[PDB]
Structures are given as C-alpha cells and as structure tokens.
RNA sequence: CGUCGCUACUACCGAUUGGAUGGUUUAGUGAGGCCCUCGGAUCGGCCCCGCCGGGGUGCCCUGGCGGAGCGCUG
RNA sequence: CGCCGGGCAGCUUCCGGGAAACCAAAGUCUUUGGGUUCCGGGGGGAGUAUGGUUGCAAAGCUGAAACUUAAAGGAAUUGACGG
RNA sequence: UAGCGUAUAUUAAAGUUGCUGCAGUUAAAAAGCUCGUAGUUGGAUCUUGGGAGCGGGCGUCCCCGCCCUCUCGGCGGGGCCCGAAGCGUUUACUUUGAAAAAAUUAGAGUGUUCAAAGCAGGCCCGAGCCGCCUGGAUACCGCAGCUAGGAAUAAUGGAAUAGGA
RNA sequence: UACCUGGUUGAUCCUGCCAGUAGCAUAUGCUUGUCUCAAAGAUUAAGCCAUGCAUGUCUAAGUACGCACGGCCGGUACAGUGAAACUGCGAAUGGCUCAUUAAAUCAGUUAUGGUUCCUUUGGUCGCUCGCCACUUGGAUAACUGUGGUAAUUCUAGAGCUAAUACAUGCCGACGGGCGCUGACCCCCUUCGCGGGGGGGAUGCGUGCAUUUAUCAGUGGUGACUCUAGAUAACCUCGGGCCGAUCGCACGCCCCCCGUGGCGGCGACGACCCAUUCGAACGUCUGCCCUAUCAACUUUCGAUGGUAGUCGCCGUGCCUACCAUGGUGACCACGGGUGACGGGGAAUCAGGGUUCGAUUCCGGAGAGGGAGCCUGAGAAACGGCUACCACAUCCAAGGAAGGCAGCA
RNA sequence: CUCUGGCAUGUUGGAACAAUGUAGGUAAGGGAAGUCGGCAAGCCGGAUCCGUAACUUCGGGAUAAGGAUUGGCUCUAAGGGCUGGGUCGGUCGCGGCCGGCGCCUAGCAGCCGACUUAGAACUGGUGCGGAC
C-alpha cells in the first residue's frame, strides 16, 4: 500500500461484532479513537445490530445528527466512533445508559446500568511519568490523560474517573486478592480473583486468576483489568456474573429454560 | 535518487540479491551538506513526516563550551585543522560532526577576566587601558574582595590551555551535526584528549 | 599496547575526563571514572569490564547498546575478526513425512567485547539480541562458558 | 540374425565468424530531474530631500504634483 | 577316540522362506523397524547423442531426449523335435 | 438420468517411488576389491527398596501424601506464618497453560416449506403485548518461539601431574 | 467402503507394465421442463485499444457587491436561496492483475530502550516581564473589457474585489519573583582588625521547543546515555509556539455614572506530550527442481573496526583509513520454474500426492526503464518530466497519449 | 642534441622558382568504388594497470583480441648503512688496571646515502610515450 487503509472487509471485521457475510461486502471501519479497532465496538453496530433502534447506516446517522448519544457525557456525531470497554453510552431522551462490558463469551453485551451508577467509569492506567515543571502525568487505557495524579497509583492499576469533571474518585491497587476481569485472549470476558503473578524479566508477565467457581485460568498481564477490591466489584456486572461454563452445562441450562417455558 | 536501501547489496554469503521492487521514497538519500566556513547560509529542506532539517551550507559563528569551566560562549570559527575521518576534508575546510577546529578565545578570556579577575592572554599589560584597570581593581568592598579571593586559589589553568590563550586560538571539537541541526556547536579540547590530538597535528606537519 | 590506536580519540561519551584538577586534589593521575551498567536478565557484569581501560561503544556493559529480544546460544567457530566472532548454532529440523529430523546449522555473527578476554574456539557463548551493530551483526556476547576446559597441558 | 535394396517418420552431426529473443555486465556517449555555486530579464520598499502646500508656532502636521537617490534594499 | 574356537565345504530335514528352481540362508516379513552403504522402476532407442573429465591412443567415468512398442522377460509343466 | 459421452491435467487405484510400506541369485538390479573424511548409527553401568489417615475399596485394590537451600516470614525480635534470591549442568523428550484474524474444515442450536444454505430466530396478544425470551458456541490450527510440571530413554559435563570440594 | 478386473503361454505360477474403474477441473459434443444458489478473458498475449463512465466535496458557523432569483418595506453594511471562484480536505483508499520475485515475498514469533505518523480522543495554549490593538499591509480570484492559435481542461496584456489565502505585528496578563552583577547602607562579637548576617540602587537571562557542554541523584524499567530537575549559553530572515478567525441566543455592572467593562454555547486553528490508524527496517524458524552448477564474495564493499556523510531512525547505506576477512557436500554460489506467498482446494484407512491466477491477509505493477513536485503518507501513473516501443489529430508551425479500473 | 678531436658538404659556382621528374608532406566528404592483386601509403606502436578466445603436440596461441592511464608542480609513505647502548675515584696510571658496583633484552640515540615504487593535492585551451 501507499498509505493508511480506510476500508474494512466484512469477514476481516472483529469476531465479536457478530457481523454477517451476506448483508454487505464491507464493515464499519472504525475511526481513530480512544480504543483499538480490534477491541472496540463502533457506535453504528451498537444502535443497529444490538439495540435495533436503527435499520441501516443512514438511520443510525440520523440519531447522531440529532445529538442524542453522549459517549462519556460528550456528544459524539461520528457514526463509526470506537466505543470500547466500560464506557457509559447514555441516551437521556430515553433515560437509558449502558456500560459496554464483555459477557461470558467474550463479546460486548447490552448491559443496562442505573443513571446514578452511570456517572463514573473505571480505567486502567497504562503508564505514568513526569512532564515539564515536574508535573506528574498519567494515561489510561481510554487514552485520556490527567495531570496531578495521586502518587500512590502505579502502572496497571485502576482509577475511578468521574464524568463531567475528569478527576479521580478512588483508585484500586493491583495485588493478589483483587477482583479483575480478563480483557483479551481466550479467557476474555471472565471474572476472578488474582491468585498469583509470575514475573518474567524481558517478557510479558503471566497472571493466574481464580473465578468464584474455583476454576483457575492464566492470562497475560496486559489482559488483566482490576474492577474491584477483594471480592466485591466496584461496578454492576453483566448477566452471568462473569463466569465461564463449559459446553456441557449451558446445554442443559438451555434445555431447562425451554422446559420451564414450555 | 541516492538510495539508503539494503537490497542493492550482496548478501552475507556473497550471493547477488535480486530486488523485488523499485526505489522507494522513504529509503532515499540526499547530497552531502558539505558545510564551509563563511557567511551564514542555511537551506531548509522538508523531510519525512513534514518536519524540517537545516542544511548548514556555510557557517561562521559557533556555540562552544569550555566544559571544565562551565563557560559556554558564541565565538567565531577560524579554520578547521584536523579531521580523523578523511584528511581531504581539512584542506577543503569542511565542517562535520567530529572535526576539530580553531576558535577565537576572545569571549573565553573575557569571561575569565570578569569572573576570576586574573590576567589571561596578557603579555605585559597596559594595553587595554580604558577597561582592564577597572576590571582588575574594581575598588570593591571587603565582602566582594573576600568573594573573589575564594575562587582565586583554584583559578588555575593547565599549561596547554593558557598557551593557546596566548596564541588567541583554542583547539575545540565539534559535537553537533552540521547539515542536520544547522549549527556548529562543540566543546573545548583539554586534558589527555588535547595532548593526544596535539601529537596528531605534530606528526601530520612539523 | 594502549587504547589509542586510531585517528580519533577513544573515550566514553558519558564520562568527563577533566575534573579541574587543581592544588586541592593531588594531581597524581587520578583514576577517571568508568561508566558501566548492569544489563538485567540475571547476567553479571564481568570484572574485566568493571576495572578495564578499553573503549568499545558496542559493549553491552560499557557501551551504548541495550540488550533486548531473544537470548540465544552457540559454539565459537572463528575468532579471526576485530571484536566480533562467528558462532554456530546446531539444531534439528523435523520432516513430518518421514517422522525424522535432520541436522541443520546457522552461522551467526556476534560482537565479542574485550571484557571476555579468554574466549577460545569451541566454547559455549550465550548472546543477546540488540540493534543492528553492522551489516550481519545483530547480537552481543553476554556470557562465556568453557567446554570441559580450564586446564591446558 | 545381420548386411544390402525400396518407402515413410523422429531426433543427431554440420560449413555458414548462421540467425532471433531475454538476462547480467567492462568501456564510451548521454536526455531529464535533484542538489550546489553563480546568474540577474523584471516587479516593489526606504532614502522623499525639485517643488509646492507648510505646522506644535524658514523652526513643515504634511495633502498632493513631481525631478529623482541615480544610493540603501527585498 | 573325543571336546572347544575360527575356516573351506558337504549330506539330510515339513525351521522358515520363495514364483519356483532352490536357499540353514536367499530364514527369523501384512505377526511388516538391529546399524549402515550402493543400486532397480515395462521393453527398445541406449550405455546412444551432447556436455564435462581421464588417457599417447584404444578407450574409461558421468550420461539424456525425441521417437517407437503390448508385451519383453523369470521359473516350472506337458508335448514335439535333435546331426 | 435433466443429464450423459469425449479429450486432456491431476488424485486414488500404485505396497508400480514403498517413512508407514517395495525390491536387487535366476525377472530390472550389489560397485572387481579394500581403505577412508563428511553423513548416519553406536555395549553394559550411577535411587533401588521401604511408608502415614485421607486411598483406581490398612479396607496389604491404593485417589495418593513421595515416609532444594536460605532472606524480610507482611497474618533488630510473637508462636497466630508463607514471600524476595539461585539451582547441587546443558539439551533433547513428554504434559499443561498463554498467544495464535476471519472465511473455509469438523461441530452445538435453529422446520430455509426439505436441502445446499443462512445466522437467525421462539413465546404469547385474552388487541394495548402501550413486549418479553434467547442464539450468533466449541474443537483443530503443523514446525519455530513463550510458561510451568515429570525425569524413564538419548547426547553432553565435574576430582587424575589434583592449578579438587 | 483399508476393493480390484482383462491382456505375454499349448496350458500354469510370477515379475511387470498397458488397458479398464472412481473422483475433480478445463474444453467440447448431444440433449434439456421447473426452482434456489452460483463461477465466469487466469492459462496463449503484464498483447493492442475507438467510445462512454469510474473522485469529488459546504454546515447556522473561512471568502458573495453574478441579478441568476428573491423578502425589500424605503433609507439601511450584509434578509434569504445562492451559480462561479479563491481557501481547506480528499484524490496514497478502493478496484484490477499476478509479469517480476526462491530466505526474496510471505507465515508464526519477537523487537523498535533504533524511528516518523494526517486525523480521532485526552492533555497544553495570561507559565515568557518585552499615535493600529476597538483589528495593520500588498495583492491575486471569480467579474467587465482586447484578443491569438487549425487545434488542447492553452491562455496574455488591462482594470477592480475579498479571506482562517499570503504577510506583519501589538496590548494584556504584569504586581513581581528567581539566579547572576552587585552602587551602597544597616544590625552586629565589636577594638587597634576581621567579622555573622541582612536589605538593596545599576545592568544581564528568565516560559515551552531546538543544539551543545556540565552537576547531582522526582518518578520508571529486567536493563538508559530514560524521564524529571540545575547551571553556562545557542536558538538558523525560504527564520518554531506564544489565536489580528467565524456563527448562536443575548443577558449583567452601573458607584466612576450613561459609555465602557464584563460575560455562556460552540466552531475553526494551533509548538509539544500521550492515544489511535498505522507505516518502515530489524530477531528466531520455515520453500519447488537441478552437481551435464563445487567452490563462491573481495579492483566497482566483499567480512569486520574507527570516525564521519546522508536518512525518520540502527546498520558499508555511502566515504576515508585500517584488519583479511565472510559463505559453502548440514549443498554455498549458479541455473530453471509452465513460482506471487499464506489462510486454503481436490483425493481421502493411516501415511501421503497434487493444486492454490481467483473475491480474505501480505507483496508487486500500471506499455519498459528512470527521475521528481505536492502532501502526514507516492518514487503516485484515471500526477508531472525525459528516453525507448507503439500510436492519435494537424492548416505540417504545433498538440495530445496509457482500459493488468466497469462495460 | 652536446664536449674532446676532426671537417668544409664530398670532381664547380651564380641567378631564378616554368613544365615533367626524383625525395618528402598535407588534403573537405566518401572509404578500395582504384588495381590482376590494398601495390604504395596510411593505421597501430613505449610503459603501467586490467583483460584475453578457438585450437593445441599442453610447451604454446599471447604484445591474442579488447579497455583505461600517461604532463608540470607541491608533498606524503615505504624500501638501507654506520658507530654508540654501563651501576660507580672502592682512586691517580681530570684519564688508565680489577671489581662490591647494573637491567637496553616490545630496542633506542646520532650521523650518512642511493635510486625505485605507491598514494594524494594543485594545475594547464583534454594537453602529456608531445621530438626521437
Ligand atoms: Mg546396516
Ligand atoms: Mg526401463
Ligand atoms: Mg492416481
Ligand atoms: Mg516392484
Ligand atoms: Mg538380471
Ligand atoms: Mg566416517
Ligand atoms: Mg547405552
Ligand atoms: Mg510468474
Ligand atoms: Mg493465491
Ligand atoms: Mg505502485
Ligand atoms: Mg495532506
Ligand atoms: Mg510511476
Ligand atoms: Mg649539399
Ligand atoms: Mg662545395
Ligand atoms: Mg580525404
Ligand atoms: Mg576525412
Ligand atoms: Mg574492385
Ligand atoms: Mg574497375
Ligand atoms: Mg606494403
Ligand atoms: Mg591470433
Ligand atoms: Mg598528474
């Protein structure tokens, strides 16, 4: 190629978008934003393929130009804005807010949240440093940067950013015994308590984490996102409480639900 | 144009490599700056990413540092005397990153007089009468005199440095990159580096 | 002989050779400080680089190179080059059809700092990836292991 | 079974400094671009500084006509 | 008159093998793997042409293709024939 | 059978290319013979045996626990405790985990009217249902590289003029 | 479904091939009622192309004095819609093809602590002491008018006219502080001296970024010559930033008063940081046939060292001086390929054997080479320049080309 | 081309500068069309650095063929030969006999002298084996 790509093929689209082959050749190529396109969910597929509010690309653009969606409390008119993980998509006309959290099967879910719980957001600090005039700076996974952080926050920790102020409400340290969620890889969308962190110098660390059911699974350090203290989460959880079920038991769960409904 | 690529070369085994695409822009090469000594002429060149590089075609002034004295002054370049890469660049009088040069000691002596209050570069005195008497005496009070005599006990200059001060020209080594930054910054040779380079000039000529 | 055998002057760019040596400090050729850095990964900086006088800008300890990437190993084959040696890495490549391996070797060019003074042909050397030092060199020697040696009759 | 005699076919050797088509190159000429050093066909500014108007009171506020400095300059 | 080991072999055997002739190896093979070299791929063209290399030469080593063909072969059986 | 014939490339047939898995007296075939470096392959030998309730039932079946050291143990002086450092070789090997695009392959669900497909879809409406319930799994992804277990087979070492612990 | 059958002989057991048999994948023949999907000028010619189209774009929010329409409501800068044109952005994506290419591309893995990055998002933008600021300068468009050429999206001379175009340049924050220089003065142990400290008149830099040199050791890595501080300076006239920009409603202060100062919502725009989209070159391992290719590379860089040049950066990328090195029977080098690589397709006991031009990812090319402008990103081809090969129109003086984009 | 030595232009001089000769040159464009026939003339040429085929009796072919360079000036580098290397009056033949009295041993110090090779800069109207 000679420059950046501005097209996205339908099959080349991320799997969790749940896009189908037959509707169109292309995909909603996400615009540049706070989240990588491989891990984001563009707003168009949110209001069309998830909430069924709009039918095609033109209709979903109509709501954006009527300025009804406020990603992080800010009006976004971009049809292909990359939402990402744990973002309050607020539509105050319907008075309904959503936190974009992965479900059990590692896909973004329609997780309705109460308006009072929608005023804050957890973020993972990706690096800290000191800039000019000896001012400490901090950046998050949401790409937002803050000046004057609390010195107790180190890297790969969690902070409770506050909407409409952009400040810190509380912070969670990353150590053994904390409740986290895997945000990438095979175990994406799973919730557990940190049990061990093996440090490999020069390479990526491996974190072993145990869910509430006792199933223990490993992942990379960069996939670890602490979302609570001890065992109590700091946010509302999606349906299923972030557990993983092998194919045997969700089969009989579906059969039992069919039996009860019949 | 000129190419910065690697695929025009024979591989490690000595075999001949067949290129798989034509010359690409990002692996380009531009002509050598060939900095000279003369009136300031600088050409701006637009480089990759829309930034700017400065071609120091001809330079006359240079920002140099004593180093052992923390004295950095903007002096003028007399002429290059040596180049460890290629002796041809010396007689062509071309300024490169690590060519050693002769610079004027006028700003360096001036700081020495106005700070240490000792003669440097002077033979017999009574040659700069409107100012030198004032700067040596200054009729200053007891506290100011007691401040100058603290630094007078360690205001000692090595023999090689003071000799070149009497010469009027100091041996300096460039550290910046003319043709890249458009400047001829550097530092002043001293110590074993000056003694070694002096033997290089002596062996070269004389 | 000494460390000055070139048209330039060999020195470590971080270290300042001149410290304004005046009457307060006895000017009896005071030892200049030596810049050295630990490289991590459990590798120990040898005493030769700690107490040495050589200058080599490509030395992992006393130079401007950072070891990062793959850590490999090999056997010294040739030592006929200035501050670099050729190592041979022997491995087995698996052929699925015949369910059998075959011996294959790769000759890798690595940079040997003079801090490893008693290297010999046939000894094991562990190397670390770095920035391209030359056309074919992208690794630096980080450790030396003798091969049933240490005794010569 | 083999020579010899007849008819077809397929390759081979072959004077012809055989011919043609690609590829890599020694040597020589060499368009065009790029850079560098000159170059200055022209287009403007200031110095105005020949006039007049003049002005806080010829000591001009300057509004113009306009020689032009035939210099300094972009 | 015996015994041991290494040999050249011999006789016999429903060890077993093999298409059989036969073979104690040519055995221990669909119950298929002790280690490791060379080497064959229907018959002709052809051990030819060409290239390289060896040789004083004669020639040696390495070594095709086009084309052509439905068989060419091996072991045994019966007959027929034999100066 | 609304399809069938022909030509040609290729696969099985072909154990007629043979690693699994072919042959070499006579069918095609082992060099005239020997030496020999690459290559390939290499005798045996180093911890076995014995244990404690949990134990494929001491229920003499045995899930099976097996009856490394040192540093703050982060629950300058508490036993209520478990983290910092290295391996008393280096490898190969095997198991686990991480990371390994989708489509395609296998495969879960789904009456597309069946199917190839596709990723949808189902439930009630007594008509206010002024809407509820789901799915869009999972497996495999060689070889190379990363992590943690095991140490049987194979290679490589230690102390021999003792410059040995 | 882990399969065979006919053919050498008078007959028989074999070896052994030929032929048969089944699938798929191109063509072709004959035939063909319905319906759902669905390939389709790859193979020879990456051969040549008439014609038509395939990339342009405006919100209330850069510039409307086109009457080209139009509310005028009528004494007023512009109601509004707005053609044209300047400015900005895009045109570097897509689509097509598979010629080149055999550790090359590409696949997995890893690094960039060795780099650049339009835009999005988040930081930062009174941090700097320094007679227009209630707004500064000269034009160029479109537009009217004179035309020339056979011709082209060719255009000149003449006259206006705009800006977020192109330039210039303040106030303000702004009271001062810091670090140097210190006129001197004062409190002082006081004594015939020093003195232990203060305020300071006068001059010098004060911020971010860039380029050096030096000092110490706020945060961070596995490891910085990291980041952040401190000092001495530099800061490139084709010269870095420190808003001379545009809409939306319009409100507040009135003591000084009564004409000025305040104010919200944006939009555009920015030096630098981070993020995103990435891109570029690197690490380890992996590729078909060929020895009738066994020794290659090294004068013209081959292998390394030192110092430079260039580049966005790391490197013989190039230059100067040195050392003679580097790769090979574990197949180098060379040649061939009817080779783009891979995900994959066919056949299907197991193992394998062929095919992958083809819709996804990566690469390469736009008739063959080469060199460039703009732009963040091109060595761009529905951009330019030159040569080579074809080839178009001509009034023979000139001009214009690139369907391996869809037809 | 010159020195030592030798000579007077070869058995006459003067004046002119016709043809035709004899000896020697040059010639635009073409390039053997001339002629029995490239006869004659012309081209090439030294040295340095590269690079050299068929064929072969393996010696040759071979200066095969083909190509580049060459001046002047200013330097640089390499290539050698001679001597001497003493720790000291412990004493007297400012010097001589033995010795308690020393560590060039990676060799220096000074002096002297040939040509030759290589590299570089500068430089001239691209001229340089400048004639031979
Ligand atoms: Mg064997
Ligand atoms: Mg045969
Ligand atoms: Mg087959
Ligand atoms: Mg066979
Ligand atoms: Mg035979
Ligand atoms: Mg052997
Ligand atoms: Mg054994
Ligand atoms: Mg091809
Ligand atoms: Mg393909
Ligand atoms: Mg291209
Ligand atoms: Mg741009
Ligand atoms: Mg092009
Ligand atoms: Mg005569
Ligand atoms: Mg006479
Ligand atoms: Mg002539
Ligand atoms: Mg002529
Ligand atoms: Mg003739
Ligand atoms: Mg004639
Ligand atoms: Mg002749
Ligand atoms: Mg000849
Ligand atoms: Mg010369």
Swiss-Prot record, chain A:
There is a cross-link at residue 229 (Glycyl lysine isopeptide (Lys-Gly) (interchain with G-Cter in SUMO2)). The gene is RPS4X. It is found in: Cytoplasm; Nucleus, Nucleolus. Component of the small ribosomal subunit. The ribosome is a large ribonucleoprotein complex responsible for the synthesis of proteins in the cell. Part of the small subunit (SSU) processome, first precursor of the small eukaryotic ribosomal subunit. During the assembly of the SSU processome in the nucleolus, many ribosome biogenesis factors, an RNA chaperone and ribosomal proteins associate with the nascent pre-rRNA and work in concert to generate RNA folding, modifications, rearrangements and cleavage as well as targeted degradation of pre-ribosomal RNA by the RNA exosome. It comes from the Eukaryota. This is Small ribosomal subunit protein eS4, X isoform. It comes from Homo sapiens (Human). GO terms for molecular function: RNA binding; rRNA binding; structural constituent of ribosome. InterPro entries: KOW, Rib_uL2_dom2, Ribosomal_eS4, Ribosomal_eS4_C, Ribosomal_eS4_central_region, Ribosomal_eS4_central_sf, Ribosomal_eS4_KOW, Ribosomal_eS4_N. Keywords: Acetylation, Cytoplasm, Isopeptide bond, Nucleus, Ribonucleoprotein, Ribosomal protein, RNA-binding, rRNA-binding, Ubl conjugation. Pfam families: 40S_S4_C, KOW, Ribosomal_S4e, RS4NT. The modification N6-acetyllysine is found at residue 232. GO terms for cellular component: cytoplasmic ribonucleoprotein granule; cytosol; cytosolic ribosome; cytosolic small ribosomal subunit; extracellular exosome; focal adhesion; membrane; nucleolus. One of its GO terms (biological process) is cytoplasmic translation. Its main location: cytoplasm. Component of the small ribosomal subunit. Part of the small subunit (SSU) processome, composed of more than 70 proteins and the RNA chaperone small nucleolar RNA (snoRNA) U3. Identified in a IGF2BP1-dependent mRNP granule complex containing untranslated mRNAs. Residues 41-103 form the S4 RNA-binding domain. Belongs to the eukaryotic ribosomal protein eS4 family.
From Swiss-Prot, chain B:
It holds the Pfam family Ribosomal_S8e. This is Small ribosomal subunit protein eS8. Gene3D superfamilies: 3.10.290.70, Ribosomal protein S8e, subdomain. Component of the small ribosomal subunit. The ribosome is a large ribonucleoprotein complex responsible for the synthesis of proteins in the cell. Part of the small subunit (SSU) processome, first precursor of the small eukaryotic ribosomal subunit. During the assembly of the SSU processome in the nucleolus, many ribosome biogenesis factors, an RNA chaperone and ribosomal proteins associate with the nascent pre-rRNA and work in concert to generate RNA folding, modifications, rearrangements and cleavage as well as targeted degradation of pre-ribosomal RNA by the RNA exosome. Its main location: cytoplasm. InterPro entries: Ribosomal_eS8 (IPR001047), Ribosomal_eS8_CS (IPR018283), Ribosomal_protein_eS8_euk (IPR042563), Ribosomal_Se8/biogenesis_NSA2 (IPR022309). The modification Phosphoserine is found at residue 159. Component of the small ribosomal subunit. Identified in a IGF2BP1-dependent mRNP granule complex containing untranslated mRNAs. Part of the small subunit (SSU) processome, composed of more than 70 proteins and the RNA chaperone small nucleolar RNA (snoRNA) U3. The modification Phosphothreonine is found at residue 129. One of its GO terms (biological process) is ribosomal small subunit biogenesis. Keywords: Acetylation, Cytoplasm, Isopeptide bond, Lipoprotein, Membrane, Myristate, Nucleus, Phosphoprotein, Ribonucleoprotein, Ribosomal protein, Ubl conjugation. A lipid is attached at residue 1 (N-myristoyl glycine). It is a lipid-anchor. It is found in: Cytoplasm; Membrane; Nucleus, Nucleolus. Residues 7-25 have a biased composition (Basic residues). Belongs to the eukaryotic ribosomal protein eS8 family. One of its GO terms (molecular function) is RNA binding. Disulfide bonds: none annotated. The modification N6-acetyllysine is found at residues 36, 127. Residues 1-26 are annotated as: Disordered.
From Swiss-Prot, chain C:
A lipid is attached at residue 59 (S-palmitoyl cysteine). CDD domains: Ribosomal_uS17 (cd00364). One of its GO terms (molecular function) is rRNA binding. The modification Phosphoserine is found at residues 66, 109. Its main location: cytoplasm. It holds the Pfam family Ribosomal_S17_N. SUPFAM superfamilies: Nucleic acid-binding proteins. It comes from the Eukaryota. InterPro entries: NA-bd_OB-fold, Ribosomal_uS17, Ribosomal_uS17_arc/euk, Ribosomal_uS17_CS, Ribosomal_uS17_N. Citrullinated by PADI4. Belongs to the universal ribosomal protein uS17 family. This is Small ribosomal subunit protein uS17. It comes from Homo sapiens (Human). The gene is RPS11.
């Amino acid at each position: 190629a000679r420059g950046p790509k501005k097209h996205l093929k339908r099959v080349a689209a991320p799997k969790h978008w749940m896009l189908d082959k037959l509707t169109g050749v292309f995909a909603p190529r996400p615009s540049t934003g706070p989240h990588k396109l491989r891990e984001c969910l563009p707003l168009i597929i949110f209001l069309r393929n998830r909430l069924k509010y709009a039918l095609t690309g033109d209709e979903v653009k109509k709501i954006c130009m009527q300025r009804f969606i406020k990603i992080d409390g800010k009006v976004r008119t971009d049809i292909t804005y990359p939402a990402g993980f744990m973002d309050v998509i607020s539509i105050d006309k319907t008075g309904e807010n959503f936190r974009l959290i992965y479900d059990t099967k590692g896909r973004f879910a329609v997780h309705r949240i109460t308006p009072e719980e929608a005023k804050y957001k957890l973020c993972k600090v990706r690096k800290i440093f000191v800039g000019t005039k000896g001012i400490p700076h901090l950046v998050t996974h949401d790409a937002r940067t803050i000046r004057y952080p609390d010195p107790l926050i180190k890297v790969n920790d969690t902070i409770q950013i506050d909407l409409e102020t952009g400040k810190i409400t509380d912070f969670i340290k990353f150590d053994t015994g904390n409740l986290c969620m895997v945000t990438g890889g095979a175990n994406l969308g799973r919730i557990g308590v940190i049990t061990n962190r093996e440090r490999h110098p020069g390479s990526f660390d491996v974190v072993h984490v145990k869910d509430a059911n006792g199933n223990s699974f490993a992942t990379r350090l960069s996939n670890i996102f602490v979302i609570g203290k001890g065992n109590k989460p700091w946010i509302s959880l999606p349906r299923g409480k972030g557990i993983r079920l092998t194919i045997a038991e969700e089969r009989d769960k579906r059969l039992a639900a069919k039996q009860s409904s019949g | 144009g000129i190419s910065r690529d690697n695929w025009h070369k024979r591989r490690k085994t000595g075999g001949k490599r067949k290129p798989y695409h034509k010359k690409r822009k990002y692996e380009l090469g531009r002509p050598a700056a060939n900095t000279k000594i003369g009136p300031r002429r600088i050409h701006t060149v637009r480089v990759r990413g829309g930034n700017k590089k400065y071609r120091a075609l001809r330079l006359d002034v240079g920002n140099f540092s004593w180093g052992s004295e923390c004295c950095t002054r903007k002096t003028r370049i007399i002429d290059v005397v040596y180049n460890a890469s290629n002796n041809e660049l010396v007689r062509t009088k071309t300024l490169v990153k690590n060519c050693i040069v002769l610079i004027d000691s006028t700003p360096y002596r001036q700081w020495y007089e106005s700070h240490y209050a000792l003669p440097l570069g002077r033979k017999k005195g009574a040659k700069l009468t409107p100012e030198e008497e004032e700067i040596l005496n200054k009729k200053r009070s007891k506290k100011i005199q007691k401040k100058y005599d603290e630094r007078k006990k360690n205001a000692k200059i090595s023999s090689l440095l003071e000799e070149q001060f009497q010469q009027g020209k100091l041996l300096a080594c460039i550290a910046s990159r003319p043709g890249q930054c458009g400047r001829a910054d550097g530092y002043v040779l001293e110590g074993k580096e000056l003694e070694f380079y002096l033997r290089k000039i002596k062996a070269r000529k004389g | 002989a000494d460390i000055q055998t070139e048209r330039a002057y060999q020195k470590q760019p971080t270290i300042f050779q001149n410290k304004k040596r005046v009457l307060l400090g006895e000017t009896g050729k005071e030892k200049l400080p030596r810049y050295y850095k630990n490289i991590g990964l459990g590798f120990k900086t040898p005493k030769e680089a700690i107490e040495g006088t050589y200058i080599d800008k490509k030395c992992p300890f006393t130079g401007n190179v950072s070891i990062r990437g793959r850590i490999l190993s090999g056997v010294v084959t040739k030592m006929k080059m200035q501050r670099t040696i050729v190592i041979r890495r022997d491995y087995l490549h698996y052929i699925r059809k015949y369910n059998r391996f075959e011996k294959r070797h790769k000759n890798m060019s690595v940079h040997l700092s003079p801090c490893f003074r008693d290297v010999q042909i046939g000894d094991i050397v562990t190397v670390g990836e770095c920035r391209p030092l030359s056309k074919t060199v992208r690794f630096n020697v980080l450790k030396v292991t003798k091969a049933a040696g240490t005794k010569k009759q």
